Swiss-Prot record, chains A, B, C:
Residues forming coiled coils: none
Localization per Swiss-Prot or TrEMBL: Cell surface; Cell outer membrane
Name of the protein this chain belongs to: Autotransporter adhesin SadA
Gene deletion effect: In vitro, loss of sadA does not affect cell aggregation, biofilm formation and adhesion to epithelial cells. Disruption does not affect the course of infection.
Top-level division of the source organism's lineage: Bacteria
Subunit structure, as described in the record: Homotrimer.
Free-text note regarding domains: The signal peptide, cleaved at the inner membrane, guides the autotransporter protein to the periplasmic space. Then, insertion of the C-terminal translocator domain in the outer membrane forms a hydrophilic pore for the translocation of the passenger domain to the bacterial cell surface. The surface exposed region contains four YadA-like head domains and extended stalk regions, multiply segmented by FGG, HANS, DALL and neck motifs.
Gene name linked to the record: sadA
Organism: Salmonella typhimurium (strain LT2 / SGSC1412 / ATCC 700720)
UniProt miscellaneous comment: Immunization of mice with folded, full-length, purified SadA elicits an IgG response which provides limited protection against bacterial challenge.
Family to which this protein belongs: Belongs to the autotransporter-2 (AT-2) (TC 1.B.40) family.
Reported function: Involved in cell aggregation, biofilm formation, and adhesion to human intestinal epithelial cells.
Amino acid sequence: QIEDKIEEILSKIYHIENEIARIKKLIEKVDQNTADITTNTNSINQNTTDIATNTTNINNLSDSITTLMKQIEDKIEEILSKIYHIENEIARIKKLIK
Amino acid sequence: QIEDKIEEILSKIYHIENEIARIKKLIEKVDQNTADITTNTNSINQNTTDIATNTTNINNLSDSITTLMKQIEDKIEEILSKIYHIENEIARIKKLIK
Amino acid sequence: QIEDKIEEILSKIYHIENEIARIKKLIEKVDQNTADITTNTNSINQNTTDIATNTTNINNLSDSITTLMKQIEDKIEEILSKIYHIENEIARIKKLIK
Ligand SMILES: [Cl-]
Ligand SMILES: [Cl-]
Ligand SMILES: [Cl-]
Ligand SMILES: [Cl-]
């Protein structure tokens, strides 16, 4: 029966080796996954930097438009004011004739 | 001869234990990868939310500039119209003199 | 000693099996991680394409504002120039009366 116990063990070992050989394939997979997570982390960081640049630039353009709006509204106000003054000079030139 | 079978079993086993001890290291590397994937997934989502904000804001500014453009074109044409009416009052005043 | 050597071996084998069963639980975890890294990679790319769109559009609005600026400032200068020539016609009309 010793000899049966031994044949039994030899089968278990053969099975075990076949299971281990399948499991060993994981080593290379895990390392590959680890490498791919790093690459993703590098792309994520680069997107974050580029989103920041865009955010900054949206904000400056927004400010820029606000400065332009003011600049123009003030020149328009000043031009309308000159026009009003000229209309008043023409009222007086008209009264001065008649 | 049994005894020889037993020694070669004991070396097969010694070898298996060394293989299993290497493979054991994978349990914690996999935990780590899983944690790092979650972190990356959190950053991806934050970038996605920030890209959305930026897209929204680009779109409002673009509309804003369009409103400002027309707003200005109208005031400029009102001004040109007042100028023309002044040019006509001066044609009169010149006539009215001679 | 033989039968003792055998009962020892059988429990070393029992433990290797327990260790292997613990390690076989990684197989699907590693597959799941791999699938999740691919998903993340897909989201990263999508974000990259949307950042590029946003970048392009920020830049065109920026240029657009620059074109609008000069367009208006030239129109305003032309209006100021018509106003000045109208002031001069009114200086003449005033001198022509008195
Ligand atoms: Cl990832
Ligand atoms: Cl993994
Ligand atoms: Cl991203
Ligand atoms: Cl963006």
